[PDB]
RNA sequence: GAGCCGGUAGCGGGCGUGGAUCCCUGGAUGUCCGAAUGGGGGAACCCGGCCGGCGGGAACGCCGGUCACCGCGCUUUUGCGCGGGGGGAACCUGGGGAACUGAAACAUCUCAGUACCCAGAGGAGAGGAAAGAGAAAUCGACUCCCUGAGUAGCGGCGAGCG
RNA sequence: GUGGUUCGUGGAGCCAUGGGGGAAUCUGGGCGGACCACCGCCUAAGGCUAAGUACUCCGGGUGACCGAUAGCGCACCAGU
RNA sequence: GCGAGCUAGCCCUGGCCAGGGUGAAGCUGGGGUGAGACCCAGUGGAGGCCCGAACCGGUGGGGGAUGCAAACCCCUCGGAU
RNA sequence: GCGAAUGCCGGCAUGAGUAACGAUAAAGAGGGUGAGAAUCCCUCUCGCCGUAAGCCCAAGGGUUCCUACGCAAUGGUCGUCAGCGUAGGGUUAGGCGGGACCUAAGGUGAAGCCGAAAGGCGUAGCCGAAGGGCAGCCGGUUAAUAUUCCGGCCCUUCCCGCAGGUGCGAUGGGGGGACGCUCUAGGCUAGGGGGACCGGAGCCAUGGACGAGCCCGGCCAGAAGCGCAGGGUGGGAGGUAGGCAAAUCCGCCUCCCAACAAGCUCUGCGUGGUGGGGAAGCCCGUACGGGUGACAACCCCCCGAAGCCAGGGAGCCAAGAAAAGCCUCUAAGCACAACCUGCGGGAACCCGUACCGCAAACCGACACAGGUGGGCGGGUGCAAGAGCACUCAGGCGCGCGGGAGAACCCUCGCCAAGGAACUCUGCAAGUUGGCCCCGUAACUUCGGGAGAAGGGGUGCUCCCUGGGGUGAUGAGCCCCGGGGAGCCGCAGUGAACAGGCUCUGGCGACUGUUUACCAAAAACACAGCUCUCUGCGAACUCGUAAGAGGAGGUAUAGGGAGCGACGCUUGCCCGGUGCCGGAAGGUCAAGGGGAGGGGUGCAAGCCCCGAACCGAAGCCCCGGUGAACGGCGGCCGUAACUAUAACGGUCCUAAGGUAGCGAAAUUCCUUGUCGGGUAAGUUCCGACCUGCACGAAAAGCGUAACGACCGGAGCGCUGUCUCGGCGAGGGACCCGGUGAAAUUGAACUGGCCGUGAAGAUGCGGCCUACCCGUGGCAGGACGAAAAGACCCCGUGGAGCUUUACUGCAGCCUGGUGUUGGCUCUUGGUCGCGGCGCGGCUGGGGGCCUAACCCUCGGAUGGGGGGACAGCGCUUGGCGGGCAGUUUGACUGGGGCG
């Protein structure tokens, strides 16, 4: 519903519950609401499984327990990520519902080895961190807009294209 | 038919009024233009 | 110096040589807008603290006065007391700054540092006692008019600029 | 690397500066047009400075200047 | 310098689509097998879906050409959550 | 010193008493006023609305509104009429709307951030609305106002007092107001309908009936008290590793009461009691009628919302805005005076209202059949419904009236007999048009193509029968069959609104969207594919540096793209080109870095030219590259009794067209040749295929459904046509009233055959030839419109293009700067193939790191990068992205030549 929320843990020692369900329209992403022991709350990110029945968390510590998330530092090696900390706290640096992470494919000093999701490879830092668990995307993909146009309904442009146009109109166009 | 005369309080004001002309250097310009140069009113006041 | 309540000549009423109309200059009022500046805003409207009478408050309580924007100095103390800004036909220097058109094209060039826009000074700014000019060991501020001179000279050495 | 200057890259200086090196306090230090010797001038890298020229909104004067389609377009409940 | 009270868009915020028709996911029940696939029947009510008013349009013909009008009148037509 | 510039300005004639009265929703009659009335006032027939030609809220316009006087001009005629003139007068609110409250976009904007200056951005706070929020309603009352004025009924906020109560006491917190769409239960006013059941004013004329007969109405609003009706939340303790920066709030875990319980916000009764209340109505206009007095009646059953309770419930995906009130509390003061309550007195503003308002008062310059947002829109009939025909309430007859009815244009109605042959074309029109039953083909992505195609039904009468709402169910109402019998007309959706169907082909799939005033299409758009730049502080787009966008996105993503479902399938060539990679070698800028020469120099010196070598991207050179640009051979021979071919011979190229298709909309020789369709068919449709010049990605062959697309054919049907011929309404014509307009030197302007500058009323010869007019018919006056758009000419202009010229924007790039330390190293060089050293100086590899930047992640510290780079200066390069010029003459037309 027109919003946005949570993405990024540093406050730890904390109860990591597995919220709910709240599958999400906004980022590809499908979250549910992680509940924490204050009672502080946040729509989480949607690295999949991790049953309603919250119960995770993180920590400087560890627990691998799927899910969850800590610092490179702080993770295993052949291991698939997520919440892909890029540089030092920058929360997520990467894997937006891109179910296909990376995977700490070899780590090096302060600086571990990450696949490059999207499509390469190289490494982080030090304690820059990122949660394991998958992604969430149901392969979010195919679907069909049949006899009409999802796009429209897209809310998300018919920005439509052209390229042959009658004219010489816009850059590189 | 819908010409384009269709005149908005509210709108033709706004858009158009002492202020504005004012606010602007432009509009201030001309304006004082007008002032001397003329006599007569204005927008807004119009 | 003896007539008047403006252009209105008209009705109805009135001031005046124990110096009226009007001519001057310095005044006190100067409602609301407008740099506006207390606050907001489609100008000429609608909103707030302090003082204020106390005011009809017939045995019941309000306008008026006021006040305060912000950048400037700095007696700094908790900062109290001075300047500014908005104009303005034309003219002034700085800041920025163009094609036409001429060259019988047009890229150099020209129109020009013009036209315009901007800032800002003034009643005038501009500039202004020389690391100047030139060469007779000669001259001396800056400016402006005539002259030097359309010369010395710049150049697809062409139009021109000069 | 640009300016202004008569100088449009030129044998091309002075003054002014966009970037980088970054001297001297009177035998110092620019200058008289590449540069060099000698001569001659001047003394910078802060500031103020009325008067002599420009301009008409304003007021006056004067006209081989006009007369209502001329003159400012507008001689009077016109930049309406 | 002047303009989106022209028009093309885009942001924000309301309003609006008389009637009717077609009948997919589902869920209920029954159906030979292990469960099922899967079948059928009921319910069910989607779709830039159909038939059509207002409303949005303006092909196809008719008039009009110093018009009613610097684009309009007439018959006709497409769209119609 | 002026005809004279389609000249400017002013007047004034033309056509011309012909053309027009702004919708073919028509009028006509009696009286009245007035100088004078088709055009005003009253009245009586008649026609048009009626989803409007209704009242209403807005926006816009602002006295246009009323009343008494008046018509000079505006009213396209009048005119005593006016939305025209002058004068006077009219619109009042604690509760309606705007503010005295709230914010999203957006705009402003102290601080902060960047510009040559003007300026740009912009936090918080503020501006900002029919979005949020907020305390009333019905009747009366003037010439106009009204939820404001009357009155009857219903309230709210602030203040002072006292009475009672309780940690009150910020807005900081927490809930909280808070919401999508499609759909639907339960209940109820609005609204409608039958009542012959109640009240009353009267009638019946006519043949008939005084009868459940015709005609009016039988309602509107309300303290709470009160039962149908739902509508929203649960209730205690404790822990609060403690949050929502600070504690009791809410958030989170644990044990008990965890219901149809109790809770708190709208409809019915009602009913306090008020009003209305039509038909009156004695005084009074018995008439511009009604202002104001009987009594009213005030009742039942029926239908029933597309948004009334309500923030419903159910489903679904593209998954639905922020600040007043309520409770928690610090600062803080109350805490015998702080807040809640109760009663009594006291206070309540600023500006908005008239009338118009699907419009002569609003935009179109005009009383212009143009547009303009919300609210039930009364009924009867039609399956339903703001569609339709008639009409209710209310509105109006178009502001020019008479009179003839000729041609002729308009709109409309009809036909025999034929029934497209008319013609480019069934363009038009006419067929057909509504619901039920029967019945439905090729093909299919099995959904559909079906409303397909093809019939048959419908009206009003009586009979017996079955169903669902009807509080049981018993004058009431509805959906409905049923089947039987029967009546009438040419006809029985009787009128009115209402598909022609089929057979085929081509393109594009499809709903779409678009060139406002020609073109809605095979054009774009697409869902869908493929290459593809990009790791974030992205890449590209605006930007002078900030910055926004991107995106609070993060490789199932963001941008660049050529095609554009789905199916089947996309082959051959990287010699040139763009690009990606390579960087060893050639080249080469600024630059370092020295041989050497030169000028002046008595001399130390003092300026230049300077070159061997080191030196950047680029370019040269190697490779990879096709859903990147682009291209994808020629002729001679041979079984072929006749023809490519199965094979063979070759010259050049980078290979040298493959699968599918084919005279297609790429095939001009062509109406190609064969076939079908026909009385003949240069369109079609099938097949061949020597494809003048298809071809896979600007796809290629096909493809159900789909199209106001285009083309081909058959049934149906009609004046489209064989000529039509009749008619109805509207101008045209005669009357009265009004009364333009472009073009035009001027003119009393005939035919001829000849002529002239070679297409003459005006010149020659001749022949007919009285003067004027009106209703017409087009030929000539080279008629009107417009100083040709097709042409060439001006060394005119303006837009797009590439290996045109140049130059800039941006991008890559060497050295240089605020860009600091530590170490690992190889090269040059001159000196003393060499090695040892030496100054010189060149290359380079490293954490650091103190600039710089970024970073953040809750503070100024940490973190990451880091000598980068941003960024400044010079170098060089790409560079049509853009900016500015250019691209000759001749020419027995411009060009090509």
């Known amino acids: 519903q027109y919003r946005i929320i949570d993405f990024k843990r540093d406050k730890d020692g904390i109860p990591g519950r597995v919220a709910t369900i709240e599958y999400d329209p906004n980022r590809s992403a499908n979250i549910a609401l992680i509940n924490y022991a204050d009672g502080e709350k946040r729509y989480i990110i949607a690295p999949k499984n991790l049953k309603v029945g919250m119960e995770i968390m993180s920590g400087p510590d560890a627990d691998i327990k799927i899910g969850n998330a800590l610092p490179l530092e702080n993770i295993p090696v052949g291991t698939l990520v997520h919440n892909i900390e890029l540089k030092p706290g920058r929360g997520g640096q990467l894997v937006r519902a891109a179910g296909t992470s990376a995977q700490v494919l070899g780590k090096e000093g302060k600086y571990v080895i990450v696949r490059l999701a999207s499509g390469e490879v190289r490494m982080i830092l030090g304690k820059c961190r990122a949660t394991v668990g998958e992604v969430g995307n149901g392969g979010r993909t195919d679907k069909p807009f049949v006899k009409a146009g999802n796009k429209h309904h897209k809310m998300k442009a018919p920005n439509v294209r052209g390229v042959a146009m009658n004219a010489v109109d816009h850059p590189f166009g | ?46």
């Open chain 2, 1 to 46: 038919m819908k010409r384009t005369y269709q005149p908005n309080n509210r709108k033709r004001a706004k858009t158009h009024g002492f202020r504005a002309r004012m606010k602007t250097k432009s509009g201030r310009n001309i304006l004082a233009r007008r002032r001397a140069k003329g006599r007569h009113q204005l927008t807004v006041s119009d």
